[PDB]
Amino acid sequence: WYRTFMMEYPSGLQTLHEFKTLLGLQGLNQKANKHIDQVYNTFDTNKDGFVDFLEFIAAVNLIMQEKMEQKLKWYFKLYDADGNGSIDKNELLDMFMAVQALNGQQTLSPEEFINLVFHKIDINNDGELTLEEFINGMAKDQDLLEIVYKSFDFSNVLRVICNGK
Numbered sequence: 001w002y003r004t005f006m007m008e009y010p011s012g013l014q015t016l017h018e019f020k021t022l023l024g025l026q027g028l029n030q031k032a033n034k035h036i037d038q039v040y041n042t043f044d045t046n047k048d049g050f051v052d053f054l055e056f057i058a059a060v061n062l063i064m065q066e067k068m069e070q071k072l073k074w075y076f077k078l079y080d081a082d083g084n085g086s087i088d089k090n091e092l093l094d095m096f097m098a099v100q101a102l103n104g105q106q107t108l109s110p111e112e113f114i115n116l117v118f119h120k121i122d123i124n125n126d127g128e129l130t131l132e133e134f135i136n137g138m139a140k141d142q143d144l145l146e147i148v149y150k151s152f153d154f155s156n157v158l159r160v161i162c163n164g165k
């Protein structure tokens with residue numbers, strides 16, 4: 001019964017702070033942190049600052065996802081900062097930054113990364129990965145996919161929920 005949520009959060013609400021703690025994401029630097037906060041936000045849908053059971057379930061549904069399609073749409077909306085339906089070179093840049101902000105990321109330096117990533121994934125070379133390009137791109141190119149994953153360790157998350165559960 002997913003009211004093992006109530007076990008951890010007797011008040012009925014989980015807060016951004018507990019979130020970080022629960023996920024070890026406590027103590028990050030300015031960027032690595034600010035980012036974790038961006039993540040937490042996408043889950044607290046009713047933007048009230050807490051993650052209540054309803055937002056909570058929506059999150060675990062997405063986490064336990066067996067299929068990666070959903071998780072990718074998630075990373076996509078998450079990086080498509082200006083939500084213009086597209087991910088430009090900047091948004092992806094930051095995306096890389098944050099990954100490199102909570103990881104001393106191995107040689108890939110934005111300059112390098114952003115291009116390799118764009119060459120491969122930017123199918124119609126418009127300079128923007130569409131949802132189609134991004135999902136499909138990241139999918140059939142499991143190399144840069146680990147860079148994405150690094151942004152938000154799903155599974156690490158799945159491990160922790162489906163453990164002390």
Ligand SMILES: [Ca+2]
Pocket residue numbers: 044045046047048049050051052055
């Ligand atoms: Ca909320």
Ligand SMILES: [Ca+2]
Pocket residue numbers: 080081082083084085086087088091
């Ligand atoms: Ca955009």
Ligand SMILES: [Ca+2]
Pocket residue numbers: 122123124125126127128129130133
């Ligand atoms: Ca394109």
